[PDB]
Structure 1
Amino acid sequence: NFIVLDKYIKAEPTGDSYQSESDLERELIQDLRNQGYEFISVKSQSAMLANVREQLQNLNGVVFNDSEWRRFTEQYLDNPSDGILDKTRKIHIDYICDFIFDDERLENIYLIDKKNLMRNKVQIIQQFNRYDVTILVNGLPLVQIHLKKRGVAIREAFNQIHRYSKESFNSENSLFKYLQLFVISNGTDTRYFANTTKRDKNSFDFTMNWAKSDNTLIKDLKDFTATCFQKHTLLNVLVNYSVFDSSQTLLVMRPYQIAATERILWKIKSSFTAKNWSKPESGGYIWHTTGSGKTLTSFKAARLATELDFIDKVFFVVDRKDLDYQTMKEYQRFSPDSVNGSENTAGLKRNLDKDDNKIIVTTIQKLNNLMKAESDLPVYNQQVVFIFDECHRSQFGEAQKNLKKKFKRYYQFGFTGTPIFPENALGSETTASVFGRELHSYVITDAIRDEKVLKFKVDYNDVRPQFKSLETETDEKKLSAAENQQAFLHPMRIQEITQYILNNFRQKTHRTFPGSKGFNAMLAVSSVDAAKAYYATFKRLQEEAANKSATYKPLRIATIFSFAANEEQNAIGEISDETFDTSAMDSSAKEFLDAAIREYNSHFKTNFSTDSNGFQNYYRDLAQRVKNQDIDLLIVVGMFLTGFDAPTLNTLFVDKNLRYHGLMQAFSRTNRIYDATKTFGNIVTFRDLERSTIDAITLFGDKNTKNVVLEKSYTEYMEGFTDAATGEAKRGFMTVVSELEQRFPDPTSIESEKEKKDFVKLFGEYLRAENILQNYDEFATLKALQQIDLSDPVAVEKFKAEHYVDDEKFAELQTIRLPADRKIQDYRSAYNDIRDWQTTDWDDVVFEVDLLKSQEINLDY
């Protein structure tokens, strides 16, 4: 019974008023009642607890006495020391209470029946100005629906609730700590999101629309109720399509993630019933674009496949190059000490012999090595499921041959963001030929439309005339031959590239505002020699800057690299796999790496050795420190470029010849959504990759996909353009600056309620434009210009050579009239003065909360 519908006929409105919260509330309660949700009147936690007692007793076939009920309540159901995370843990992991009754007998008390989902009781209650419907599961408040007036903007509604994170609890409301899901609606638009204490997942960007399997949205509250709020749909979303990970983050899956998972599950059942196993028609493949949640989804799909009573083993297979701190932490819980960068199979052989267990997490490298050496494994004759998460190739081809030869009853599935088509299978087997049919898809154009993945701002930094010919070279033989100190690794090119990165790092990563946290960056390079050259030049130029200024704030730079198997004899599209056996590297490489590791150790007070165990532990710690921004810039060759998840990484500096799938995978390191401060990922290249970018985008889309994936120009954001995909006109920053000065020249004078509303709407566009434009070198150069003031013999230029601007460009730039930095702060404080205060409609008005919050709070020193 698919819960992400193939087809759905839109419901028709009742001729009754549908404008106020009460109107939305009445129809919500009515449709839910029509859909099997008993409406009950509760006006206290005492009445809520009495109802929980009835449901839990009913569900478990037990009757508590008052003493036993009070004891269950205080020790398991509503412990006063329990927070939201404890309740999430109780719903998703510890949902069974081993309860000892007064007669000393043991009873297993379930909060939810997860095997027979429809056995659970579902009820609805209403608020006891804050119009809310709550869905109760066995009396527990698991879903809360916020209803707002039709005119109110859903983003401001959501912002008003997250305004103050002072979510305090008491003995009269502590049952609400059990909430798993929130739904915010205004009638026309309806968005859902997880109840999580993790502020890094609490922005509007993580709110989701319900949808159909073709990924078309279900925005209308009435249609949302008729689909998402069906008992069978909601209970599956809460119990099976919600993840509570090792970091104690609750994640509710998006419709596309649910659509792919149930279609894989259905296909295993189908192929088993029809005895049609061990064929490409037994499994299938999923095309979910890079960064859309493939690693989240496939692992959950694997875990749900273990629940199929007829299945014996479920292999969840990842490429070791995609491993990072968070995924390694997660896999450690299921397959201890067996998912790492080594070639060892001992862990895999041990996990396979574990009884009362079906999940096997391993790498494609370890699975290949096992199938090579072993031929008498009992697993080969068992009913086995394979879930491959982006297992690229190199090792996958060999792995497929032994798999088809040794495994007798299997269903294999693959998840990929960049499939192998014939047009890029000139030295590989296609996704379709390996796996069979495309079970579900969620393409980059769908992800961008949904704001579930960010766009790319891609630019070649053409500011080195001496080296342009090398940097614009298209011949493969010439590019590989130019990997030396006379060509690409020339001290002056490396000094020029590094000096640009040091001067523009803070601009690119939004660290320019004083109290602003900002983002961090990565630098992907051509070779181990390039990695060496850059790390050295960064250290040199940074040591030089610390001498010339005691006010200098250095950046924490790190590097990691190993030996690439096919660096000489390969292609150009696939990023070369690096071994975890450091003893394969040349003496100077190993020497340089140890020197960098010792500097890392001294700074972070760590003791990572040079050996295999040492490097593996260094890889893990490095991944975590780049993700939490302990490291400002990570220098890499081919590592942390295909699976590394870092939502606060926004800039990728590139001095490498990236092509097709490798280009998409690498650029996508910056594509994670965060909040309004992260508008897109910056791609700054020192080799011309404009053609390679368009070729890569077009391969996993069409001729138009580049207009959606790539960000617009500086002139366009300064003067205005019309988005082709949305059909709407976006006002240019200069148009907004002009209107701000004409309509509101105010020294503090402001005006009426109509002017205040008009200003908030205007300055909101300003903040959104200024923040988007921070990512533009042209805008940075323009903003830097507003600083000088001199007369007769004194200090001049410097700006020209640092911004690579001639005397002609510098002449016209002075004519550009921008508002004074104090007037912007006057507008920023005038805007903040209208923060809340408590005619003219303030309904459709949205404040830039995330963009504002980049203020000057407790940075003091």
Structure 2
Amino acid sequence: NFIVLDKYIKAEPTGDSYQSESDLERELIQDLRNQGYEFISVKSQSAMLANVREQLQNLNGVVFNDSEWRRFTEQYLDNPSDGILDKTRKIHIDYICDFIFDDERLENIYLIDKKNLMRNKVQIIQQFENRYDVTILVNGLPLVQIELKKRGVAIREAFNQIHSENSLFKYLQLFVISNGTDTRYFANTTKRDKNSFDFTMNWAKSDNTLIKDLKDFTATCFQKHTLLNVLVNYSVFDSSQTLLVMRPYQIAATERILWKIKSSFTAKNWSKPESGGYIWHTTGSGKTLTSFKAARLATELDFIDKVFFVVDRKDLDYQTMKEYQRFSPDSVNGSENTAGLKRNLDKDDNKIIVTTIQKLNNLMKAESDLPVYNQQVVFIFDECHRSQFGEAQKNLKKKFKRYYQFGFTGTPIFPENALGSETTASVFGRELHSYVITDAIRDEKVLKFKVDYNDVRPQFKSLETETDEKKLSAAENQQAFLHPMRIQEITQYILNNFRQKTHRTFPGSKGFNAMLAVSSVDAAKAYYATFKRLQEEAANKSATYKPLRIATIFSFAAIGEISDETFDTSAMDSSAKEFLDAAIREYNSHFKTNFSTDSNGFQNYYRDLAQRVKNQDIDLLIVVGMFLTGFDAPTLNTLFVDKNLRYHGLMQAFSRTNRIYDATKTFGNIVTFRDLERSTIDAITLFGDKNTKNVVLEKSYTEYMEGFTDAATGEAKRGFMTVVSELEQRFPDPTSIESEKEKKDFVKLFGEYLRAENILQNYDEFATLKALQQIDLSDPVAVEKFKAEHYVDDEKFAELQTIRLPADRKIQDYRSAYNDIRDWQRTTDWDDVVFEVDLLKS
């Protein structure tokens, strides 16, 4: 009885009126009632509390007197000081009130019965108090809100508009918005960085096919058994108090894992590859959230004795270390130590064990008669890299007698890229669920890549295109790849363009931040020094220079694979260690921290550093191989690459930028100073087919300027230049926006202008062209200063003067008129009109 279906037959429309919001509401209420939801009339919170009282008394087999019920209400159900986050805490964690009655007896009052899910009462009400809405009540509590809109209302624009009193609606867990054609759901959270339209979701089948229209969505997502499982078992409330409602592919993998455990155990078919399986969920789609959730659910199987959740120490960061601290405290870090692991093994009244693959492998090497070897064990592995996982499989196959193991990866091991390691299929067995990169990009759940070799260094181009590895390793020195000029030109390019790439030029726009991945410890030292020197230079030239805050971290290591670096700082050579030492000193003075480079300090520095790159206390992080495979930073959008990446390491590193955020983060920028074009196509193609690169890789500057057709859709996209031309041709101004119609058409057109400029801000050709508009062509020093900073010659310089762009004045005239029209939105038809709210606020 899976809740993400393998097969689904589309319902038929009634033939009745299905245009207005009250049309959608009629059929939704009717459909929900056919599915066992009792409709009640509720006109007040007083009537809501009364209904809650009836449902919780039924559920819990107990009758409150009135004084008790008022007390229950003021102190647990409906505390006046509770906010949304407090009700989510109560739904997901604190759902049992141990209540003391007037006669002093003690009873557990459940808000929700989680073990007997179907015992919960589900009800529907319509909106009471202009807005058409239906609310699903679970034991009288409002947990879902369905916002209904007219057909042909832009669902996105409606979302922007709506995202005490009455306080019971703080309990809402889930939103659904629908114009009948499209239906999206999203979590009720106060975290604004999770509140953008990018975080709404379509329901779907296990093959990932969308289920969009409200009638089908009603009959699938809104089956009591579906919706209640989504609400209770497939929504995560983490240690940072963020509610995340899982996407269908995440749920689809999870339930298929659990069902596979049970049928294997019932078949007494354990400890073979046909006992478990793997999940192919593409990089950045939620493997770490999902696999961890599936491990937590697995502990609720009464016949399993211990569930191992295994991560790679390479992949740890602040948020996930905070998470794991709650379940396996002081045990999930970067050290080789197993004391914490073996202590959590001995904890009774506990089934989940989080650990790293380095630790699990160490313990299994040294220990031989652990009780857990003969128990019923689930293994859930979250992207464990090739070399350490290989030795761990040997001892696991050797020593666990009754296990069911599962793996999540975004970059499987096929015959073609095996050389050395066992294929993913041979280790884990069947592919239980797949959600691949073209799946995720079509669903807009990860971001595309803009990948460009920055070929502006002729003296060094020969090296930066070298392909023999022997030669490439031999060029990691100051005569070649670490030539001070090359390091300077590259570092200068990054300082001249960081704000352009991260969307920080036109303030007070927050923007994004970036990483720089390099080839070696010496490379990191040269770059950190050059940045330092070049920024002290800029501080003297201009006194209005605003510096970037730069940091680095690395230790010592040891195709496709990114080298594993140890957390044992005593492994490094004296020079690397004293450099990393001096960097932490500067880091300490700035952030008023006090980390050292002993093991404990380095580990805490690593943990602080991840936090500050994620929240942009750091502008640019320089690494060799750390934070390249698991680090989750939605507001990081640019990876500067001076490194030879291939195959799965390529996919992982680039994907540091691939997190969706809002409409300002159109894709991740990958700026490379070695030519990685062949490697990018080879790596994309290895994890898809020959067409996959056309979905993953962004179009050229000429395409966004002049227009193209998205082959994935058939959607013609107008070019910037066509838009700009239409703006002048049809709106040379103020009299052009006289009539309502002309106002609507202008908003539509200027919205495309804003989408196109924001895309084009990531193209060096466009930044160069914008820069030229701010120049005295008579002034020859500033003409020469622009040529050298944008790498244009006298020929290229000639051509760009001919490209006519609209003046800053006419743009800000467009901008404020656009705002007028937006704020006025309090014959002609405004429903389909999406204002570009995020791009504005930028």
Alpha-carbon offset, residue 785 of structure 1: 0.2
Residues 689-727 of structure 1: CA deviation (Å, up to 9, x unaligned): 000000000000000000000000000000000000011
Structure 1 residues 712 and 172, CA gap change in structure 2 (3 angstroms): closer
Alpha-carbon offset, residue 813 of structure 1: 0.6
Whole-angstrom CA distance in 2 between matches of 1:729 and 1:593? 51
Alpha-carbon offset, residue 822 of structure 1: 1.3
Alpha-carbon offset, residue 192 of structure 1: 0.1
**Bigger CA drift: 73-82 or 547-556?**
547-556
Q: 2:772 aligns with which of 785, 789, 795?
A: 785
Asked whether the 8 Å contact 2:275–2:405 carries over to 1, the reply is: yes
Whole-angstrom CA distance in 2 between matches of 1:475 and 1:718? 37
Asked whether the 8 Å contact 1:45–1:172 carries over to 2, the reply is: no
Residues 84-137 of structure 1: CA deviation (Å, up to 9, x unaligned): 000000000000000000010100000000001000000000000300000000
Alpha-carbon offset, residue 789 of structure 1: 2.3
Structure 1 residues 528 and 188, CA gap change in structure 2 (3 angstroms): same
Asked whether the 8 Å contact 2:775–2:782 carries over to 1, the reply is: no
Whole-angstrom CA distance in 2 between matches of 1:184 and 1:409? 46
Structure 1 residues 67 and 800, CA gap change in structure 2 (3 angstroms): same
Whole-angstrom CA distance in 1 between matches of 2:704 and 2:514? 24
Q: 1:802 aligns with which of 786, 789, 794?
A: 789
Alpha-carbon offset, residue 758 of structure 1: 0.3
Alpha-carbon offset, residue 836 of structure 1: 3.6
Whole-angstrom CA distance in 2 between matches of 1:439 and 1:315? 19
Structure 1 residues 804 and 140, CA gap change in structure 2 (3 angstroms): same
Residues 575-605 of structure 1: CA deviation (Å, up to 9, x unaligned): 0000000110000000000000000000000
Question: Structure 2 unaligned runs (5+)?
Answer: none
Alpha-carbon offset, residue 541 of structure 1: 0.3
Q: 1:642 aligns with which of 629, 633, 637?
A: 629
Whole-angstrom CA distance in 2 between matches of 1:144 and 1:153? 19
Residues 176-222 of structure 1: CA deviation (Å, up to 9, x unaligned): 00000000000000000000000000000000000000000000100
Residues 451-499 of structure 1: CA deviation (Å, up to 9, x unaligned): 0000000000000000000000011100000000000000000000000
Alpha-carbon offset, residue 267 of structure 1: 0.1
Asked whether the 8 Å contact 2:776–2:782 carries over to 1, the reply is: no
Q: 1:597 aligns with which of 573, 577, 584?
A: 584
Asked whether the 8 Å contact 1:364–1:391 carries over to 2, the reply is: yes
Alpha-carbon offset, residue 426 of structure 1: 1.1
Alpha-carbon offset, residue 795 of structure 1: 5.3
- 1:344 pairs with 2:337: yes
Alpha-carbon offset, residue 393 of structure 1: 1.6
SS of 2:323's partner is helix
Q: Quick one: percent identity of the two aligned structures?
A: 100
Whole-angstrom CA distance in 2 between matches of 1:298 and 1:791? 62
Structure 1 residues 375 and 825, CA gap change in structure 2 (3 angstroms): same
Residues 38-75 of structure 1: CA deviation (Å, up to 9, x unaligned): 00000000000000000000000000000000000000
Structure 1 residues 41 and 344, CA gap change in structure 2 (3 angstroms): same
Task: Name the structure 2 match of 1:135.
Answer: 136
Structure 1 residues 347 and 715, CA gap change in structure 2 (3 angstroms): same
Task: Name the structure 1 match of 2:146.
Answer: 145
Alpha-carbon offset, residue 686 of structure 1: 0.2
TM-score with structure 2 length normalisation? 0.99
Alpha-carbon offset, residue 515 of structure 1: 1.1
- 1:463 pairs with 2:451: no
Asked whether the 8 Å contact 1:126–1:134 carries over to 2, the reply is: yes
Whole-angstrom CA distance in 2 between matches of 1:190 and 1:409? 44
Structure 1 residues 513 and 126, CA gap change in structure 2 (3 angstroms): same
Alpha-carbon offset, residue 355 of structure 1: 1.1
Q: 1:625 aligns with which of 602, 609, 612?
A: 612
Asked whether the 8 Å contact 1:460–1:686 carries over to 2, the reply is: yes
- 1:709 pairs with 2:696: yes
Asked whether the 8 Å contact 1:577–1:638 carries over to 2, the reply is: yes
Task: Name the structure 2 match of 1:165.
Answer: none
Whole-angstrom CA distance in 1 between matches of 2:15 and 2:543? 72
Task: Name the structure 2 match of 1:43.
Answer: 43
Residues 5-29 of structure 1: CA deviation (Å, up to 9, x unaligned): 0000000000110000000000000
Residues 775-831 of structure 1: CA deviation (Å, up to 9, x unaligned): 000000000000112548875421111100011111111111110111111101000
Residues 531-573 of structure 1: CA deviation (Å, up to 9, x unaligned): 00000000000011101111110000000001102xxxxxx31
Residues 405-443 of structure 1: CA deviation (Å, up to 9, x unaligned): 110110000000000001000111100000000000000
Question: Structure 1 unaligned runs (5+)?
Answer: 163-170, 566-571, 855-861
Structure 1 residues 12 and 749, CA gap change in structure 2 (3 angstroms): closer
SS of 1:415's partner is strand
SS of 1:98's partner is strand
Alpha-carbon offset, residue 160 of structure 1: 1.0
Structure 1 residues 221 and 336, CA gap change in structure 2 (3 angstroms): same
Alpha-carbon offset, residue 750 of structure 1: 2.4
Whole-angstrom CA distance in 1 between matches of 2:645 and 2:104? 68
SS of 1:536's partner is helix
SS of 2:782's partner is coil
Q: 1:847 aligns with which of 828, 835, 838?
A: 835
Residues 264-298 of structure 1: CA deviation (Å, up to 9, x unaligned): 00000000000000000000000000000000000
Please tell me the root mean square deviation across aligned C-alpha atoms, in Å: 0.9
Task: Name the structure 2 match of 1:166.
Answer: none
Alpha-carbon offset, residue 610 of structure 1: 1.6
Whole-angstrom CA distance in 2 between matches of 1:680 and 1:740? 26
SS of 1:580's partner is coil
SS of 1:113's partner is coil
Whole-angstrom CA distance in 1 between matches of 2:394 and 2:53? 57
Asked whether the 8 Å contact 1:44–1:172 carries over to 2, the reply is: no
Asked whether the 8 Å contact 1:321–1:642 carries over to 2, the reply is: yes
Whole-angstrom CA distance in 2 between matches of 1:616 and 1:475? 36
Structure 1 residues 821 and 792, CA gap change in structure 2 (3 angstroms): closer
Alpha-carbon offset, residue 392 of structure 1: 1.3
Asked whether the 8 Å contact 1:290–1:665 carries over to 2, the reply is: yes
SS of 1:788's partner is coil
Whole-angstrom CA distance in 2 between matches of 1:830 and 1:816? 26
Whole-angstrom CA distance in 2 between matches of 1:431 and 1:527? 30
SS of 2:107's partner is strand
Structure 1 residues 690 and 71, CA gap change in structure 2 (3 angstroms): same
Whole-angstrom CA distance in 2 between matches of 1:156 and 1:256? 26
Whole-angstrom CA distance in 2 between matches of 1:541 and 1:789? 26
Whole-angstrom CA distance in 1 between matches of 2:696 and 2:543? 43
Residues 725-776 of structure 1: CA deviation (Å, up to 9, x unaligned): 0111000000000000000000476210010000000000000000000000
Task: Name the structure 1 match of 2:158.
Answer: 157
Asked whether the 8 Å contact 2:148–2:177 carries over to 1, the reply is: yes
SS of 2:404's partner is strand
SS of 1:213's partner is coil
Residues 304-342 of structure 1: CA deviation (Å, up to 9, x unaligned): 000000000000000000000000000000000000000
SS of 1:427's partner is coil
Whole-angstrom CA distance in 1 between matches of 2:305 and 2:777? 79
Whole-angstrom CA distance in 1 between matches of 2:651 and 2:507? 33
Whole-angstrom CA distance in 1 between matches of 2:468 and 2:359? 36
Question: In the TM superposition, what are the counterparts of 1:428-447 in structure 2 within 5 Å?
Answer: 428-447=421-440
Task: Name the structure 2 match of 1:180.
Answer: 173
Structure 1 residues 525 and 794, CA gap change in structure 2 (3 angstroms): closer
Whole-angstrom CA distance in 2 between matches of 1:535 and 1:762? 45
Structure 1 residues 146 and 794, CA gap change in structure 2 (3 angstroms): closer
Whole-angstrom CA distance in 2 between matches of 1:792 and 1:593? 45
Q: 1:276 aligns with which of 269, 283, 295?
A: 269
Residues 151-184 of structure 1: CA deviation (Å, up to 9, x unaligned): 200000101112xxxxxxxx75100000000000
Alpha-carbon offset, residue 303 of structure 1: 0.1
Asked whether the 8 Å contact 2:736–2:742 carries over to 1, the reply is: no
Runs of 4+ aligned structure 1 residues displaced above 6 Å come to none
Structure 1 residues 316 and 595, CA gap change in structure 2 (3 angstroms): same
Whole-angstrom CA distance in 2 between matches of 1:105 and 1:688? 74
